[PDB]
Amino acid sequence: INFKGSPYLDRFDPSKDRTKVLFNPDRPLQQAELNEMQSIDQYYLK
Amino acid sequence: FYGHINMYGYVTSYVYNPGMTSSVNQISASTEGRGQEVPTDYYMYTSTKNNNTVELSMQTTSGVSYLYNNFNFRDYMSKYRPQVDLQSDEARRIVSDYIKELSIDYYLSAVIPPDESIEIKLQVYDFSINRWLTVSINNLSFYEKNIGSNIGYIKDYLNSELNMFTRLEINAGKRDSVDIKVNYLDLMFYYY
Amino acid sequence: MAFNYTPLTETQKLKDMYPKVNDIGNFLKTEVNLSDVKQISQPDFNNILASIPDSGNYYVTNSKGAPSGEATAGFVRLDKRNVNYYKIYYSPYSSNKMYIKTYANGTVYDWISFKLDEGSLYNEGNTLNVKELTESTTQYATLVNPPKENLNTGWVNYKESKNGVSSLVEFNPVNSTSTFKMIRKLPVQEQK
Amino acid sequence: MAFNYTPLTETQKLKDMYPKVNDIGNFLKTEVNLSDVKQISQPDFNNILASIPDSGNYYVTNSKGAPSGEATAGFVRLDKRNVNYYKIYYSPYSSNKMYIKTYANGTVYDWISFKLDEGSLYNEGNTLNVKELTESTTQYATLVNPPKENLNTGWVNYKESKNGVSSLVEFNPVNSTSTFKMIRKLPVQEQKPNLLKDSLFVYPETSYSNIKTDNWDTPPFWGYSSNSGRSGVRFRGENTVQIDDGSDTYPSVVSNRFKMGKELSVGDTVTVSVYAKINDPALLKDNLVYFELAGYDTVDDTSKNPYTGGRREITASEITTEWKKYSFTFTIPENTIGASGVKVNYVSLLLRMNCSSSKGNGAVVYYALPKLEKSSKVTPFITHENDVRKYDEIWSNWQEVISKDELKGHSPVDIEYNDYFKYQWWKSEVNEKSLKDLAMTVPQGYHT
Amino acid sequence: ENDVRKYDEIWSNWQEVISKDELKGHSPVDIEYNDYFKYQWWKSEVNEKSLKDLAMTVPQGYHTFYCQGSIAGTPKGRSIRGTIQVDYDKCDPYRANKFVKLLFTDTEGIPYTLYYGGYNQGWKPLKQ
Amino acid sequence: ENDVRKYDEIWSNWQEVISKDELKGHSPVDIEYNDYFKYQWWKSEVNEKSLKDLAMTVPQGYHTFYCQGSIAGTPKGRSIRGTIQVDYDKCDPYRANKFVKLLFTDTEGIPYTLYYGGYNQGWKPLKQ
């Protein structure tokens, strides 16, 4: 399985140490961010 | 400055073949419900040199199939080089006369071992006589490889829409279906 | 599932009858005259009774031991006589194909489809090696390995021998008052 | 139809249980293990779930979107997972056949029939039109359009492409050793007749004087000037004419006339088309390669071929050593154009070279496969129906193919015995016959 | 892969089979008309073309022929039977010149030769 | 039952059919190259053989030929067009003597013959 594919998009980068998600207000939202939030956590947990 | 139009692309083991007046989308509407669009991965990862490679399947006969990639230089002037003359059939030539030796670069790898290997060929539809021009040939393994090349003066490949269509001879050996890895997508010339 | 019941009598008070009426109508809501065939998840065709123990009509998802070269999701009918004797019939979700497998006293008559007549018409415009995939085929097809470069499209008929020893090919170009024939003399192999 | 149950309680009286015992019982009676399949009226097979929502067996009437060539009534089964995933099986009432169609998540697998087991044998004694067969076949059959009228019965093998772009016939008569073949080269389409008799140039040549007639019944329909004729060059297998740049100012191959009011009229739109090529584009100079309808006030008119406007013109850069299709369409005018101005009452097709500008340069121009038709466009080449040789752009002719034993009939040598003499006379083998005796025994042909 | 004669141990080479019109092209005799002359001519059917003019239309190769003695340029006015041989310059029938040779016999069994050079060198004198 | 050429009415014999290469074997002309001469002999292509030596190269059968007038033995230094016939005594090329015949014409339309006879008799010279 892979959530970097559409619509889930998961543009997280462990090699950068992408470290936190900084969500923005009352927003029509790319759910693209969201897999990538738990993905940020999943690198450091893993 | 340099040539820069980067993300059209298409897949079919079958064929269509236009005159010098068909536009970008005509790889799709022609191929009979027997062809495929290049996906978001191909559209977005391959945009510049990096490490998150695309991997995608390829419909095939006994390993053979055709990958068609495609751009229109009317976008290049309008979106990137505004001063250039667009509005006559001479645009094919005069753009080429400025462009000099254009190269296509395109980095890929096979879904087989580093030693196991396959046989593949570049074709470009000749936009002067409408015949498939085979003028580079390649072999591959699990290693990343450019199968682009210098293709030189593009007077022979700009159609009068300013569209161009390639096709690439995809291969797998004597096997029943295939998959291919892709890293890059770039139409490339110099002027300054 | 078969329905389960136990009869009432004259002496049984009104309080004893209403539970029975409820059981009957629930079974009619959950097993009988279903709009959609009952779904069953991850069944194995090599042991199908362990996931589909009853005769009836079903849709299977994500199954194991499906026919060779098919989907794992599709419609199933099961007809059963006892655990020594039954017939499985399977139709993949992604085609009009139908497959049959008969179980008989521990012997298995394994998967084979009923043949669709694809028309007497023949499949067209594919581009072929002379040394093509694992089955005989007839096609109005195109050749990477033609008799002559400018003759590559027309009627093809390809045949293959059961042990892979030999094959026979006939070809008729659309643009020619000629026929062409070819044979494989050796089993196909590593040739330097 | 599905059931819809909800329970009862102990304190409820008999008056409250009867409505529910009836709902159950009516459901069982009208829905469960039916004797006949339900009957369904006006189902669209492409939206069948509007008429057959539930998985079961059915009979249909007045339907829409049934398979190619099948009854609007028949037995139907539905197997369904939900509205986006289902299978229809149609067996027409009038046949053992069985057709299937499948819907899958916004993709459709359209109607097709299962095949019936028929052993190994081939059909026989049928009478087939292989120019109308829509299905590939193999049979021992007679042909409606046989290659030669006597070669009408034998083994046949017909092939048809999955969208009808082409077909191929192979044929082997019982009363012949030969194979025959014929190919439909083009999709089924409009092809107006060709008004020009002898467009493959098989009748004797003649003077361009003899063709000052409107007689399309009697050959030769083409006349020849000085410096025009039938060539020793062939195109795609057929004969050709050539025009040579010799001493004539306008070397021409000229048809018989058409009288205005017969096949053609003033105000009819017409099309003319040809293949052409030159021996060398450097030898044409300022001459012109062209073909035209010339126009005349009388059938016998001695005038130097007045121009109607109905012409295609070709130059020394625009003709090549490669055979290229040229054509014109025009409306037949009231009066002619350029240096004559006469009425149009008769016309003729001329295939020409204009040698006003230069002569004797050695320019040879070939012309092949000319067509004249009443059409706004070029339609595919055909001969006239009553030429003694045919050729067509939609169909090939029949092509004969022979055995080595027939070739050993024809051949000047014994081809099965290593090209050795077709006859060999030795003194011990002639029963004392002389050379003049032996020579009389030899059959027709050229023999070693 | 690139050689001018091809062979493979794993596959045959492609076997072309041709039609009888093409084969009639190749033959010295009219194999559609029971091995009769590869050319026949009758005076009423030839637009006042001489033997020379009907020899000129014949395609490249080797052939049998017949000419009727009322046709012009026939020797002493006799019908003739014989063989005709034809070549284009460097074998290019679509731009080049044509060379023609006849060896033939009249009605009395007498042998004659006639020859045509290309590039308009034309007919070399009639030899009996 | 034992006959040396069979026939039946219920069946047929096997009728053979052939390829254009096999026909290019039997043919007197090059059927792949627009029916040209089956043997063509230009001085740059003969590897310094004479006309008489070139003739001994040819295999059993009948073939058309052309030979260039700078090649040794050719008449008046002119090129020649002709035909060549070859056999071995009783069709045994392993043990038997060869025979060869050439009939040909120069550039003036003049007829010439040259012939080779087996069993020590070898070459018999040029007839005009």
Strand pairing partners for D330? D270
> Vertex F120, ends F116 and F124: CA angle to 5°?
30
Closest Cα in chain D to C40: D81
Q: Which of F16, F60, F85 sits opposite D418 (nearest CB)?
A: F60
Cα–Cα distance, E67 to E74 (Å, whole number): 8
C166-to-C157, C184, C187, F19, F85 alpha-carbon distances in Å: 14, 5, 7, 20, 41
Cα–Cα distance, D79 to D90 (Å, whole number): 12
Closest Cα in chain F to E111: F111
Q: Which of D53, D135, D165 sits opposite C120 (nearest CB)?
A: D135
| Helix, strand or coil, per DSSP, at residue F18 | coil
The number of C-beta contacts closer than 8 angstroms across D and E is 58
Give the sign of the dihedral formed by CA D436, CA D438, CA D442, CA D445.
Answer: negative
Amino acid code (one letter) for B116: E
Nearest CA distance, F87 vs chain D (angstrom): 7
Q: Residue E64 class from Cβ within 10 Å (0-12 exposed, 13-18 middle, 19+ buried)? A: buried
Tell me the backbone φ, ψ of residue D382, rounded to 5 degrees: -145, 150
D104-to-C13, C189, D81 alpha-carbon distances in Å: 53, 40, 10
- Is the CB of residue F4 less than 8 Å from the CB of residue F12? no
Closest Cα in chain B to A8: B40
Nearest CA distance, F23 vs chain D (angstrom): 9
Where are the alpha helices (H) located in F41-82, listed in sequence order?
51-57
Contact D162 C123 (CB under 8 A): yes
Q: Does F26 touch chain D (CB under 8 A)?
A: yes
**Residues in chain D closer than 8 A to F92 (CB atoms):** none
Closest Cα in chain A to B53: A4
Locate D433 and state its tokens: 């016959």
Nearest CA distance, F12 vs chain D (angstrom): 10
- For chain B, the residues before each gap (C–N > 2.5 Å) are 7
Contact C185 E14 (CB under 8 A): no
Q: Which of F15, F59, F85 sits opposite D405 (nearest CB)?
A: F15
Contact C188 B174 (CB under 8 A): yes
**Residues in chain F closer than 8 A to E113 (CB atoms):** 105, 109-111
Cα–Cα distance, D86 to B163 (Å, whole number): 42
Closest Cα in chain E to C173: E16
Cα–Cα distance, D196 to D223 (Å, whole number): 13
Strand pairing partners for E29? E37
Chain C, 17-46: which have a CB under 8 Å from a chain D CB? 17-18, 21-22, 24-26, 28-29, 32-37, 39
Q: Does D108 touch chain C (CB under 8 A)?
A: no
Contact C96 D85 (CB under 8 A): no
Locate D398 and state its tokens: 């029949």
Count each helix (H run) and each strand (E run) in chain E, helices first. Answer: 2, 9
Closest Cα in chain F to D422: F61
Side-chain half-sphere exposure of D366, counting CA atoms within 13 A:
26
Chain A, 1-46: which have a CB under 8 Å from a chain B CB? 4-6
Cα–Cα distance, F113 to F104 (Å, whole number): 6
Task: Give which of E20, E124, E128 to mutate to test F binding, by max F Cβ within 10 Å.
Answer: E124
Contact C178 E18 (CB under 8 A): yes
Q: Does E56 touch chain D (CB under 8 A)?
A: yes
Cα–Cα distance, D231 to D223 (Å, whole number): 14
Cis peptide before A7 (omega within 30 of 0): yes
Closest Cα in chain E to D445: E35
Instruction: Give the DSSP letter of residue B162.
Output: S
Locate E68 and state its tokens: 């009727």
Cα–Cα distance, E14 to C169 (Å, whole number): 9
**Residues in chain E closer than 8 A to D447 (CB atoms):** none
Contact F26 D407 (CB under 8 A): yes
> Vertex C158, ends C155 and C162: CA angle to 5°?
165
Side-chain half-sphere exposure of D442, counting CA atoms within 13 A:
18
Where are the alpha helices (H) located in chain E, listed in sequence order?
20-26, 51-56
Locate D58 and state its tokens: 């059915």
**Residues in chain C closer than 8 A to D3 (CB atoms):** 25, 28-29, 32-33
Cα–Cα distance, D80 to C74 (Å, whole number): 10
Task: Give which of F22, F64, F105 to mutate to test E binding, by max E Cβ within 10 Å.
Answer: F105
Closest Cα in chain A to B51: A15
Q: Which of D205, D232, D401 sits opposite E58 (nearest CB)?
A: D232
Q: Does B175 touch chain C (CB under 8 A)?
A: no
Cα–Cα distance, B178 to E53 (Å, whole number): 65
Interface residue ranges in chain F relative to chain E, Cβ cutoff 8 Å: 17-21, 23, 27-29, 31, 33-37, 64, 66, 81, 83, 103, 105, 107-111
Query: Does F contact D via 3+ CB–CB distances below 8 Å?
Result: yes
Contacts of residue D241, Cβ cutoff 8 Å, sequence gap at least 6: D201, D222, D228, D229, D230, D231, D253, D351, D366, D367, D368
Q: E33-60 burial, b if ≥16 CB within 10 A, otherwise e? A: eebebbbebeeeebbebebbbbbebbbb
Q: Does C129 touch chain D (CB under 8 A)?
A: no
Report which of D246, D319, D310 is spatially closest to residue D288, judged by C-alpha positions: D319
Q: How long, in residues, is chain A?
A: 46
- Look-up: residue for tokens 């295999």? F59
Report which of D442, D151, D406 is spatially closest to residue E34, judged by C-alpha positions: D406
Which bin fits C99, alpha (ψ -120 to 50), beta or left (φ > 0)?
beta
Contact C177 E18 (CB under 8 A): yes
Contact F62 D415 (CB under 8 A): no
- Is the CB of residue C36 less than 8 Å from the CB of residue D80? yes
Q: Which of E9, E12, E21 sits opposite C183 (nearest CB)?
A: E12
Strand pairing partners for D413? D421
Q: Does B41 touch chain A (CB under 8 A)?
A: yes
Q: Which of C125, C127, C134 sits opposite B64 (nearest CB)?
A: C127
| Helix, strand or coil, per DSSP, at residue C3 | coil
Q: Does C137 touch chain B (CB under 8 A)?
A: no
Task: Give which of C186, C189, C190, C192 to mutate to test E binding, by max E Cβ within 10 Å.
Answer: C186
Contact F16 D403 (CB under 8 A): yes
> Vertex B33, ends D102 and B41: CA angle to 5°?
105
Contact A5 B52 (CB under 8 A): no
- Is the CB of residue E85 less than 8 Å from the CB of residue F63? no
- Is the CB of residue C62 less than 8 Å from the CB of residue C40? no
Count each helix (H run) and each strand (E run) in chain A, helices first. Answer: 1, 0
Give chains near F: 3+ CB pairs under 8 A: D, E
Locate D205 and state its tokens: 């040549």
Q: Which of F16, F59, F61 sits opposite D404 (nearest CB)?
A: F16
Closest Cα in chain E to C188: E10
3-state SS of chain D is CCCCCCCCCCCCCHHHHHHHHHHHHHHHHHHCCCCCCEEEECCEHHHHHHCCCCCEEEEEECCECCCCCCCCCEEEEEEEEECCEEEEEEEECCCCCCEEEEEECCEEEEEEEECCCCCCCCEEEEEECCCCCCCCEEEEEEECCCCCCCCCEEEEEEEEECCCCCEEEEEEECCCCCEEEEEECCCCCCCCCCCCCCCCCCCCCCECCCCCCCCCCCCCCEEECCCEEECCCCECCECCEEEECCCCCCCEEEECCEEECCCECCCCEEEEEEEEEECCCCCCCCCEEEEEEEEECCCCCCCCCCEEEEEEEECCCCCCCCCEEEEEEEECCCECECCCCCECCEEEEEEEEECCCCCCCCCEEEEEEEEEECCCCCCCCECCCCCCCCCECCECCCEEECCHHHHHHHCCEECCCCCEECCCCCHHHCCCCCHHHHHHCCCCCCCC
CA terminus-to-terminus distance, chain C: 63
Contact D402 E94 (CB under 8 A): no
Measured from the Cβ of residue B21, the count of other Cβ atoms closer than 10 Å reads 11
Strand pairing partners for D241? D230, D367
Q: Does B62 touch chain C (CB under 8 A)?
A: yes
Task: Resolution in Å, one decimal, please.
Answer: 7.3
